[PDB]
Amino acid sequence: VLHGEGNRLFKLGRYEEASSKYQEAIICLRNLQTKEKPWEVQWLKLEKMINTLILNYCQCLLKKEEYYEVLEHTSDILRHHPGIVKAYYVRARAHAEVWNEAEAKADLQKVLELEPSMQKAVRRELRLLENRMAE
């Protein structure tokens, strides 16, 4: 119930309230994971749920300008799951907002490589990055 309620709150611009729901959900699913063997199938099913929740939480953190925290959370996902396009995309956005031009561009290049249909979205992020870098 928490995932959908976080999402409903986020749509109403209630980013603190949504963050709390997502964090409660993550902790609960992490606790369920401790009863499973890591990297076996039950654990991995929960891991996908957690990753969606962490990315949604990162969306709240982006609205709060907690960019360095987003960098940390998406990097923790990507250290274990190097193929998750959406984690690179979220990390790239955070990098761009804190003027890490090379790191933003590297993540967007990974996005393009892993999911070529994101080309339009990558062009948009690159424009935003160029605006930030105008400095």
Length of the chain: 135
CATH code for the domain of 105? 1.25.40.10
Give me the half-sphere count of Cα atoms (radius 13 Å) on the Cβ side of residue 133. Answer: 15
CA nearest to 81, candidates 50, 121, 112, 42:
50
Number of domains in the chain: 1
**Angle, helix 85-97 to helix 101-114, in steps of 10 degrees:** 160
CA distance 14 to 67: 18
CA distance 42 to 29: 11
In which domain, by residue range, is 67 found?
1-135
- Please report which residue ranges of the chain form alpha helices under DSSP H: 2-11, 15-33, 41-63, 67-80, 85-97, 101-114, 119-133
Q: Resolution, rounded to a tenth of an Å?
A: 1.5
Task: Tell me the backbone φ, ψ of residue 79, rounded to 5 degrees.
Answer: -65, -35
CA distance 2 to 25: 6
Distance from chain centroid for Cα 122: 16
Task: Tell me the backbone φ, ψ of residue 22, rounded to 5 degrees.
Answer: -65, -45
Amino acid at site 90: V
* Distant-in-sequence, close-in-space partners of 65: CB < 8 Å, separation ≥ 6: 97
CA distance 69 to 71: 5
* Distant-in-sequence, close-in-space partners of 96: CB < 8 Å, separation ≥ 6: 104, 125, 128, 129, 132
- Cα-Cα-Cα-Cα dihedral sign, residues 112, 115, 118, 124: negative
CA distance 102 to 129: 10
